[model samples]
Target: DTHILVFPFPSQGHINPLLQLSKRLIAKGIKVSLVTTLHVSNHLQLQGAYSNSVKIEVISDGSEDRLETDTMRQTLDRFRQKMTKNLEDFLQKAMVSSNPPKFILYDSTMPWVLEVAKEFGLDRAPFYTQSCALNSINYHVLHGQLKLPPETPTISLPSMPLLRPSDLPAYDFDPASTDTIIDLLTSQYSNIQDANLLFCNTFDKLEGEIIQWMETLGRPVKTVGPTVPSAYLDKRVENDKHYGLSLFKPNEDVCLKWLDSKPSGSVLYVSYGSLVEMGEEQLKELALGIKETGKFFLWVVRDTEAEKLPPNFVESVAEKGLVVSWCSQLEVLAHPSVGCFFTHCGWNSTLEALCLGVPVVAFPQWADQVTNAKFLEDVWKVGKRVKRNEQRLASKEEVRSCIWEVMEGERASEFKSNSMEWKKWAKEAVDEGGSSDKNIEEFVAMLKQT
Candidate 1:
């Protein structure tokens, strides 16, 4: 058997999604070592001993490099820190064995890996770990092709590769924010210029507009995901029951019971994903929005500490809503009770919602989120967009109207119909002879050849 060393940028959001992919990979009899930093290893240990199908390894002794912010920028910085040195050590130890990794699978933030690929003479790849549209934007920015105007609605090229620069996403023009990950990616991204391959965690069906760069970028990249297997695919595959695709937040069964109580096509799921932060004011706005809609909601509010609902807001909504810090997104979306999703447009969440035929109100925060949202609204026709207020905040009125619009309006009907069609195509893609299944099988056969 061949081994695939899986190195996720050391963070919850980055780790969990890759773990789900690794779970499916392991089911294929591949040996996977989930690599991380010492600090992250400690965090995972306190949670529980991970299943034995994969071995979790920590490489804390290397250079003491960390990301800029514990909240969001960490994902970018962790990738820049790279896992090559640690991988080299792991490979050196494993070289004595009968079987060793002929390749490496890593997150895009793992910047030091291009050097590693040269040292071992092994194939390597960096998973963008984000919307491919955004990566497409980075590709343009890398080439200095985008031009931002000084005018309001400040047009610039979309993070998505194909969108006209005249209709750029808001973030494309925002210069005030000091924390754009693109700032780092544009400069250091070329480190992976010579990488053996690249992986986009999205399916070709979802990213309609921006996939052309994959071939043009010089790396052997492939779009084999949305990894719709999360919930959209039949559960015949044993590893599909990934409870937390983006976090190991203790699973709260109360959500399932709440779903059980709600009528089919009645509950709305509100989750902003791992990186988007909402203060008490925005939290209250969300609470009020869900209340005003009068629809049942299953919301996930991540507390950097513990996701406690806004004070007194819980009592106000009572049985009308249930808010947890983390959620089983795929399971919730698959439930008949879930009619719409409020999300951050993270690629994983978008694919999950798409695969399950659920409409969405995209509350994109940063990075490729803006790009992902555009595709969701335009190309896929499975969702609507909710712009941040002038102050760059998601407001009460917007949230309230979004819930109503997606759950009731003609757009909602269109979204449901289109998304369901996408769902069917997704199923066909992962079936015995589907594109994704064939891709993975081909990847496995390559492992054997190496």
Candidate 2:
């Protein structure tokens, strides 16, 4: 039997896609060991999640509770130093096993993993969790082919639409770009050319031109996504309803039951993903916005951020709204009652909404999210972006109008229709005999041959 080691960055967005990919690989009869930090593995209860199918391997990142005290740079440096050493030790032991891993699939963020794979003589590939367009922009910036703060009013990249400064990631143009993050992003391509393969969490049709441009890098760029759960898209993998691992346990029953009570296309689903931390004022404004819309709504407020919600907000909206710490986002999005998603436009959330035929009110916050929002509105034509006031806050009116525009305004039908179209395309790309399926087949064949 063929064996592979799969590793992903420890964030919720990054880990979920790679976990979905691992499921696909396991379905193909390949043995997989998913590597995650000890903290994550414990927090997500990964030890018993997949049982025998996809083995969970945990390695320490040096300190579990030290992040609060250390700077971002300090924390990352410690993680890299410790994880590299620990991964090497694990690989050394695995190489001697009867079912040793022959390939290593790793997240693009940790480029140093490539060196370790080479040291062990294992075939390796970098899995990009972001869209092709976002990665393309990062690649150009890393190679110095694209300069930041462009002199031109609008910038054009091969196979992508002309983009305004706002469409670019803040790191690309913001002087405030921290050295830690820039170095981390640029390092993704530091040794990318040497990888045995490259995989992206986006389907071909969604970004065919950009994927084509990526192929020009002289490596096979495989689109093995939207990387959403199998049950939602093609229903090919048994019991593949959720990502199976979450940093926060979802209020699954409460959320689904509430949606069950609502009329079709009548609820707004709002979640900023696991990482975004909105200020108290912004949170209050968003609460007011959702309240003003006068539509049924489900809002996910993680425990850490729950205090930021306006006083009496939950009690006030109890008649028409449900507020939970977290919920199985895919399940909520797939519910018939969900009319639109007010999202941060994290790639995973974006892909899930697209996969489920749900339109969006894009309230992007940082990094690739801004770019994803741009595509969601301007290119995909499936959503509207919330306009922020001069204070850089998405005011209550902006949020309310954006939600109304996507849910009940004149363009609502157009948004719904376009979203459903993408839903069709997304499913077609992942189902049997589809583009993503073909790529997976080829990938499996290559693994078997090696």
Candidate 3:
């Protein structure tokens, strides 16, 4: 069996997809050694949901403490900065062992890992956790083709529609905090250009235009996702439902039971994600919006950000809704009761919702989220974006109205139908002889040849 070292940035989104990839590789009789920070490792162990075939290794990256307070970008910067040396040390030790890995498969954020792998005479591949469309957009931005200014607010691409500057991911980041990270992004694009093969967590059909566009660049890009849990896809093992790597302890039992009591296709699932810090004003707006819908709702308000919610909102909604710090998102999305996902349109959250056939009300926050939001509205046609008011935040009226459209508008039926269509294609992509399955098979065969 060939050993593949799977390394991802220390985030729930990054870890989950790569962990799924590790499991898929193991099912093909390949050995996988997944690397994460100590905090992630302990959390995965506590869940007891990681694959038995894969080995989990920890890099004492010093992210064991609360890494950052406000921004995901800064937290990522801290991770790459602190983890780089620790990772180098970890790699040096692993390389000296008699049984070393054959190749390095790492996430996009850690481009420096490629140089480290090359030093050991090992080949490296990208495990892109974001959309191929967004990657292409970033490629253009890096090459100076996609400029960021209101004068040239819209730019046309080979694969998709003319994109507004607002739709671009550039708005998602803070320039000051993101200086060094941009270097990492550019390096990743540069490396990807010359790499013989890239492993992406998307399907050929879903991002058909973007995938086709990448082909013109003269490198083989493989789509081998919804890199979700095998238990969800194949239902092979009961315990394998979740990829089993969560940074937070999910309040699953109560949430799942609550979902069971809701009528089919009736619940609205709302969550912003791990790194987002919502202010009290916006939180109150969202709370008011949910009240307006008067629908069965399940919302995830992170523990740190809970105090920002409107006072007594939780007590008032208790009879009709459930608001927990965390819940099993995958389980909730797949439930028959979950009709719509009101999300920040993060790529991971986007993929999770689509794979489960749950429509979305895109309240995109930042980063690639803007791109993901555009696709949900334009390409996928399964969601409508929540608009911001003149003041530049999604007002309670906007949130309420968008949720109404996704949940009860005339287009609601169409959204559900489109979501189901995507779910079918997603499952088929991972099934036997499907495009993604063939790609992975070819990928493994190429690795074996090397």
1 against 2, candidate with superior TM-score: 2
- TM per prediction: 0.83, 0.93, 0.89
The best candidate in terms of lDDT: 2
lDDT of 1 by residue, 1-450 (tens): 778777887766677657766766665667777777777765564222445367766765635555455544664445344455567777777655677677778877765765776777767778777776667566666676653332333334443434643234455434544436456566436766777667777666666445655666676666657555543575546445553323344555677878988899899898887667656677677678778898899887666723444667777777787867766777788889998988878777887887788988888776567767877887788878875576766777888887788789868778889988988877766666666666667777777787
For each of the candidates, the C-alpha root-mean-square deviation to the true structure, in angstroms, is 4.3, 2.6, 3.3
Report lDDT per candidate.
0.69, 0.86, 0.79
- Residue 1 alpha-carbon offset, candidate 2, angstroms: 0.7
* Over 4 Å off, model 2: 47-52, 61-66, 148-150, 171-177, 245-252
- Which residue runs does candidate 1 get wrong by more than 4 Å? 45-52, 62-84, 147-180, 187-193, 228-236, 243-252, 302-312, 324-327, 393-395
Over the stretch 76-127, how does candidate 3's per-residue lDDT look in tens digits? Answer: 5566667767767887888788777788888977777777777777778877
Whose lDDT is higher: candidate 2's or candidate 3's? 2
Which digits, one per residue and each the tens of the lDDT, describe model 2 over residues 111-189? 8999999898888999998999988888878887676555567878888988887788875333534666777887887
- Preferred candidate (TM-score higher): 1 or 3: 3
Which residue pairs clash within candidate 1?
Answer: 79-109, 79-110, 79-111, 80-109, 203-225
Record all residue pairs in model 2 with backbone atoms less than 3 Å apart, i.e. clashing: none
What TM-score would you give candidate 1 relative to the actual structure? 0.83
| Candidates 2 and 3, the one with greater TM-score | 2
Which ranges in model 3 have alpha carbons more than 4 Å from their true place? 46-52, 59-97, 170-175, 236-238, 245-252
